[PDB]
């Protein structure tokens, strides 16, 4: 005999994200093998963990920064830590992160000196947690978390921004500067002036790379912005 049943209030509804399959129409098809293609990607983090070049303003954009010769106490360059900020816009970390809502883990920064082999100097890198006003001098910078990097044989030096947050997970866009979106600043200080022998070009250049850390993680997908087509 017929099994008696009563459908629920939710019937004939079409839900895009429903976690289930549907009815086939043209089954029994067999396809060519794909064993010959190497380098299968299993998770997009594999691509998020590859360094890429950032951008700045030369006033009209370049990835590097030119070390001046004048003497002043302001930071050489400083940008905030917010994945929606323009500097991270074109880097892979930012581009992928803009399609989600939350993140964890430690961000990573890398530099490389491309000046003459005969030069010598030292630089100071610091990371300042949030405050009423951002740092503006070496004395203030020394107190926060910082490290000293000196020009030598090896060319590059890596820096890690620790994950220090009042809550697990953080927003990936800053509609307003709540403590859950913005997380301080990063700034670079020229500790000592550069020394060059006679008859050498002045004003060397330095280069930046940005990538995800070891324990980086994303979550909660979201729809993407199509404005690029225009």
């Amino acid at each position: 005999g017929p099994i008696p049943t009563a459908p629920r209030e939710n019937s004939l509804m079409f839900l895009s994200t429903l976690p289930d399959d549907t009815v086939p129409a043209y089954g029994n098809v067999r396809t060519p093998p794909v064993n010959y293609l190497p380098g299968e990607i299993t998770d997009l983090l594999q691509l998020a963990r590859i360094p890429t070049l950032m951008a700045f303003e030369r006033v009209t954009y370049v990835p590097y920064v030119a070390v001046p010769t004048q003497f002043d106490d302001r930071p050489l360059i400083s940008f905030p830590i917010t994945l929606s900020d323009p500097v991270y816009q074109n880097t892979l970390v930012g581009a992928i992160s803009s399609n989600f809502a939350n993140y964890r883990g430690c961000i990573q920064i890398t530099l490389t000196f491309c000046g003459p082999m005969m030069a010598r100097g030292k630089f100071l890198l610091s990371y300042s947690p949030p405050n009423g006003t951002q740092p503006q001098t070496l004395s203030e910078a020394m107190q926060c978390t910082y490290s000293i990097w000196d020009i030598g044989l090896n060319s590059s030096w890596t820096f890690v921004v620790p994950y220090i947050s009042p809550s697990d997970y953080r927003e990936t866009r800053a509609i307003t500067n709540s403590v859950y979106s913005a997380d301080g600043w990063f700034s670079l200080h020229k500790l000592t002036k550069i020394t060059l022998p006679p008859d050498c070009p002045q004003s060397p250049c330095i280069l930046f790379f940005a990538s995800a850390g070891e324990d980086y993680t994303l979550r909660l997908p979201v729809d993407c912005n199509p404005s690029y087509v225009f």
Partner: protein, 258 residues
């Protein structure tokens, strides 16, 4: 029986302590917190979109700004105004004069039994029509995001973008209902019934949490921009907490004495 109430801790007794008697049987356990809160209830009533929308601006908005009001509903027991979180509940006792009237909401039952401080639970949503034989759809996006506002041209027919996206969109047949459940997705571990902190480091408003909600909901008519009708439409929203928990006692509202 002799005791000292100043110590704060007082041990509950029975009839037999000071008189001849006996204790009663248990009975039933309808006071269980998990079992109490699993019941649907009305939350808010909103209009239905017939074109691309413009999300309301922040609260310091002056006059003359163009936007759409009363089209979005927040998912949160706390008070809200103009589709944005608030701190004080509002009420229009004199519907007259110029100015736009601000939408408001609240969860009367939840705050009538809000005896604790922190809360956490999943949430199941349902929608229902208030017009005869209406066709509509419902959209949603998680906490801490924003609604895309633009349209595309197909065959010279404008189509709003909110049709498509990788965050749930659902359709119902003539006179049907929409139902589904959501997870707890806010960054905060628990939802504060009452709060006394500040979100921004300066120029903040004390006691106004930033992300105490589940998401946001809206409804729209699946037709192109070329079919903007002449009459407004409304729908009703129902929510139902699921697998709830509480964490710290508090006090209940003040029932005024006539």
């Amino acid at each position: 029986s002799t005791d000292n109430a100043e110590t704060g801790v007082i041990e509950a007794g029975n009839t037999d302590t000071d008189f001849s008697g006996e204790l009663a049987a248990p009975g039933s356990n309808h006071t269980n917190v998990k079992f109490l809160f699993d019941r649907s209830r009305l939350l808010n009533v909103i209009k239905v979109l017939e074109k691309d929308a413009v999300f309301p601006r922040p609260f310091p908005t002056q006059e003359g700004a163009q936007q759409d009001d009363g089209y979005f509903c927040l998912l949160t027991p706390r008070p809200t105004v103009a589709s944005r979180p608030a701190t004080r509940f509002g009420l229009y006792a004199n519907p007259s004069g110029s100015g736009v009237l601000a939408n408001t909401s609240l969860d009367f039952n939840f705050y009538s039994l809000a005896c604790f401080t922190y809360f956490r639970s999943d949430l199941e949503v349902t929608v229902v029509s208030l017009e005869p034989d209406l066709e509509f759809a419902v959209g949603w996006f998680p906490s801490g995001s924003e609604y895309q506002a633009s349209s595309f041209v197909y065959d010279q027919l404008h189509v709003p973008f909110h049709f498509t996206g990788r965050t749930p969109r659902a359709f119902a047949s003539k006179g049907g209902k929409v139902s589904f459940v959501l997870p707890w997705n806010s960054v905060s571990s628990v939802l504060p019934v009452r709060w006394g902190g500040a979100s921004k480091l300066s120029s903040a408003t004390r006691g106004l949490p930033a992300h105490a909600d589940w998401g946001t909901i809206y409804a729209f008519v699946p037709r192109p921009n070329e079919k903007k009708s002449t009459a407004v439409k409304h729908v009703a929203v129902y929510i139902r907490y699921k697998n709830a928990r509480a964490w710290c006692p508090s006090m209940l509202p003040f029932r005024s004495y006539k």
